[PDB]
Amino acid sequence: EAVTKTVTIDASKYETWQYFSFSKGEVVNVTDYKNDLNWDMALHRYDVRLNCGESGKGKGGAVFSGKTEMDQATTVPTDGYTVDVLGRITVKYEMGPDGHQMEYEEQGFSEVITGKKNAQGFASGGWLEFSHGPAGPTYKLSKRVFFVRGADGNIAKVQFTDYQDAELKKGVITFTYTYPVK
Amino acid sequence: EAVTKTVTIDASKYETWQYFSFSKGEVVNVTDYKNDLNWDMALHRYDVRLNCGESGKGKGGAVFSGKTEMDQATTVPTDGYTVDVLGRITVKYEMGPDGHQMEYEEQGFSEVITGKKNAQGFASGGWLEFSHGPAGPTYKLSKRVFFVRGADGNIAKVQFTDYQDAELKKGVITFTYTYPVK
Amino acid sequence: EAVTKTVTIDASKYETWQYFSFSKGEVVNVTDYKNDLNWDMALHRYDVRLNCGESGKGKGGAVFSGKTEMDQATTVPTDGYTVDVLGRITVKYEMGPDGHQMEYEEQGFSEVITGKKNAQGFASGGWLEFSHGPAGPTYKLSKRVFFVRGADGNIAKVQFTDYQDAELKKGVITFTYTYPVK
Amino acid sequence: EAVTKTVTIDASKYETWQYFSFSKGEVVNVTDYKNDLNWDMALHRYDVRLNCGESGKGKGGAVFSGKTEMDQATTVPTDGYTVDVLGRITVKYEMGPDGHQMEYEEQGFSEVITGKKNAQGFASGGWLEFSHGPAGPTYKLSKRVFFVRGADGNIAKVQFTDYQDAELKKGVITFTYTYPVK
Ligand code: HEM
Ligand code: HEM
Ligand code: HEM
Ligand code: HEM
C-alpha cells in the first residue's frame, strides 16, 4: 500500500510557494491556498507549510519522529500533529551596495518541519540548520524524519535530503516521502 | 547613605576583563578573579560579570527591577537574584579577508545584565540589544535598571547609559550606579 | 538593408558563454569557439567576447564610437577594430561562510566592450560600470555605442541596454544591434 | 654623518595626520601644515604626506630607489623626485548595519610612498599593497626603499617595516630611516 518516492522541487523564488500533492505525486497549482484541500505540503526557499492551522483549512499537521533514519521511524502517531502557526517569511531578496535587502510578511508555516527562526531570522530545529559564518551562509541537513498529515488526513513519512540541486543551485529542495502510512 | 555616580570604563580589549569595585569607585587589579573579594562587577566588551556563581566566590548576583528609569526603581528586592553562569566569551577578534575571525572561551558571566546569547552569538534581554543589519552591527540601549549585589552582598542600583565613548569608540562602557541601597 | 533588433540572452551561468550570430539573430551552439566562424559575439555574465584575437579566428573586433546614443553614431569606421586579448574570467562562483568564493581562467575577451578589470576584478570603461558599495554590487549602464565586426567582417552597431531581466535576475543581458552597417 | 633609526607612530585615527621631523626624530605639533617647515613626513592610516606640492611649501618629495633592501640602495638620487598631488583621504570611518561608512576629502599626499588609489580606493605601488579578499582586508608590505627629501631638502632613506603594532592594532606604522644621506 505505502509507496516510497523522492521529489525535487525548485523553491528558489522568494515571492511564491510551490504546492505539492502527496496522492498526485506532483506540484499542483494553487491560487487560494487557505481555501483549497488539493495540496498537502508547500515549499518556499527552506520554509515548509502544511494544509492546516494558519495556512489552511485541511487536516494537516506534523510531528518529529525522534529519528534521523526513515526505517527506524516505524510507529505512526495517531495524534499530536502540530498545526501551522504565523511566522516571518522572506518575500523579497536583493543584493546591492548595502548587502542583501529583504522584505517580509507574516504567514503560516510548519514550525515543526521548518524549524523556529531566531532574532536575526536563522531557522533551526527542523529539516535544515541554517546559519552564517563571518561572511555568508552555512547549511546542515538534520535528516529529521517527520510524520506529516496531508489535507485529507492521510499521513506521509517525510525526510528532506537536499537543499540544492546537482549544480549547487540553492533553494532546490529534495525529499523522500513514504505514503500513505498507517 | 546612598551615593550616585557615573563611571566610564574602556572594555574594548577582547582578551581581558576590567574589574570594578563599588565601594572604591575605581577599577581594581585582579589576577585571580575566582578567588578575590575585592571586585564587584567586571566588564568585557558588552559582557558583564559578577562576583558569584561561575565567576567568583563572592555574594554577588543580579535582578532586573522591571523598570527603565533609576528614579522609578525604589524598592530594593530581597529575592530573585541570579548568579553567574557559563557562557561564550569572545577572547580574540581580527578582521581579515574572510571577515571577522573570532576565538571563544566558556567563562562565567551575568546573563541577567549581559543578556542571553543566541546561536550566532547575539545577546539580548540585558543592558544592550546587540544585533546586525545585512552587513554590520546595530545597537540599542535597553535602559534596564538592575539591582546588583557586590562581593560582600551590599547592593548597587545600576543602569548602563552608553556602549561607546564621545568619539564613538565601541566597547567603552558607561553606567550609573547608586550604592549602597536599602 | 540594415535592420535594428533588440536581443536578450541569459548569460547568468559562470561556467560557460552564450554565443550569438548577428546574421541569424539567434544564439548558436559552439563547441570549438577558437575554430568556428558561425558566431559573432559571446556573453558570459558581463563579459563580451568577439571572434578575433585571443578568442577566435574570425575577422571580429570592436571600436567605441564616442557616442551614447545610437542615432548619433553615423560614421562607420573602416579600421581600428580592436581584437580580443587575454583577461581574467570568473568561471565558478559560490557564496559560503567566507563570502563569495570564485575560480578564474585567463581567456580571450573584448576589452573595448567589456571594459578593463582592475586589481580587485571590477570592470569599467565598456558597456557596464560595475563596482561595490561597502557590502555589495552597484551597476551603471554606460550606454556606450560600439561598432562591432562579426566573424565575416560585416559590422553591427551595438548598444547594451540592460544587465538584468524584468524580475531583476542578474546576468541576463539585453542589447540593441543594427546590422549590417556601412 | 647619517644615523639610522626605527620609528613607530600610531596613525590609526581617520580624522587627523601625525607629523614627523627627521632632524628632531620626534612627532611634532602642526596646526597649519601647508605653511610650516617644521615637519618632513606625515602619516594618516596608510597614507603618507611630504612637505611639498599640494601638501606644503617645503622642498620635499620622494623617489622609489628600485630596491627593497636598505643596504642595497647606496646611491642617493639627485633626480626623479615627485611632489605631493591631490588624492582621496578617508577622514571618517564607522561600521554599522550597512558595512563601513566612510567620508572623504581631497587632500595632498605622496603618491610615490602611499601608492596610487584605484576606483574602489585600494592603494598599491607604494609601501603597502592593501586589498580585500571576499570579506575583508589583506596586507602586504612591499619593502620598497624610498629616498625622501624633507622640508629643507635634506634627504632620508626610508623603508616601512610594519602597518600594525605588536598587539595587531592596525594603522600603527613603523619605518626605518637613515638621515641625512649624501
Ligand atoms: C558578508 C556579508 C553577508 C553575505 C555575503 C551573506 C550572504 C547570504 C546569502 C548568499 C544568503 C542566501 C542563502 C540561501 O538562502 O541559501 C543569505 C541569507 C541570509 N542571511 Fe546573509 N549574508 C551576509 C550577512 C548577513 C548578516 C550580518 C546577517 C544577520 C546577522 C545575515 C542573515 C541572513 C539570513 C537570516 C538569511 C536567510 C534569509 C531568508 O531567506 O529568510 N546575513 N545571506
Ligand atoms: C558584512 C559583514 C559583517 C560585518 C562588516 C560585521 C561587522 C562587525 C563589527 C564591526 C563588529 C564589532 C561590533 C562591536 O563589538 O561593537 C561585529 C561583531 C559581531 N558580529 Fe559581525 N559583521 C559581519 C557579519 C557577521 C555575520 C554574518 C554574523 C553572524 C553569523 C556576525 C556576528 C557578529 C557577532 C555575534 C558579533 C559580536 C562578537 C562579540 O563581541 O562577541 N557578523 N561584526
Ligand atoms: C558584504 C560583502 C560582499 C557582498 C554581499 C558581495 C556581493 C556580491 C554579489 C551579489 C555579486 C554578484 C554581482 C553580479 O554579478 O551581478 C558580487 C560580485 C563581485 N564581487 Fe562582491 N560582495 C562582497 C564583498 C566583496 C569584496 C570585499 C570585493 C573585493 C574588494 C568584491 C568583489 C567582487 C567582484 C570583483 C565581483 C564580480 C565577480 C565576477 O563576476 O567577476 N566583493 N559580489
Ligand atoms: C564583508 C565586507 C567587508 C568587510 C568586513 C570589510 C572590512 C574592512 C576593514 C576591517 C577595513 C579597515 C582595514 C585597515 O584600515 O587596516 C576596511 C577598509 C577598507 N575597505 Fe572594506 N570591508 C568589506 C567590504 C568592502 C568592499 C566591498 C569594498 C570595496 C568597494 C571595501 C573597500 C575598502 C577600502 C577601500 C578600505 C580602506 C579605507 C581607507 O582607509 O581608505 N570594503 N574594510
Author numbering:
A (entry chain B), B (entry chain A), C (entry chain B), D (entry chain A): 35 to 216
What does the original paper state about this entry?
The protein is functional as a dimer in its heme-depleted form and as a tetramer once heme is bound. Structure similarity searches following a variety of algorithms failed to identify significant matches extending beyond selected parts of the central β-sandwich, so we conclude that HmuY conforms to a novel all β-fold.
In addition, we solved the X-ray crystal structure of holo-HmuY. The structure of HmuY is asymmetric, with maximal dimensions of ∼55×40×35 Å, and it resembles a right hand. It consists of a roughly globular nucleus reminiscent of a palm, out of which protruding segments mimicking thumb and fingers emerge. A single Fe3+-chelating heme b molecule (hemin) is inserted laterally like a wedge into the cavity, curiously with its charged propionate substituents pointing toward the palm and the hydrophobic methyl and vinyl substituents pointing toward the exterior. However, the most relevant contacts are the metallo-organic bonds established between the heme iron and the Nε2 atoms of His134 (2.04 Å away), provided by thumb-strand β8, and His 166 (2.09 Å), from ring-finger-strand β11. These two ligands occupy the apical positions of an octahedral iron co-ordination sphere, whose equatorial ligands are the four porphyrin nitrogen atoms (at 2.03–2.06 Å). The quaternary structure of holo-HmuY is a cross-like tetramer of complexes, ∼95 Å in diameter, created by the combination of a local and a crystallographic two-fold axis. The overall arrangement entails that the four heme groups are in direct contact with each other in the center of the tetramer.
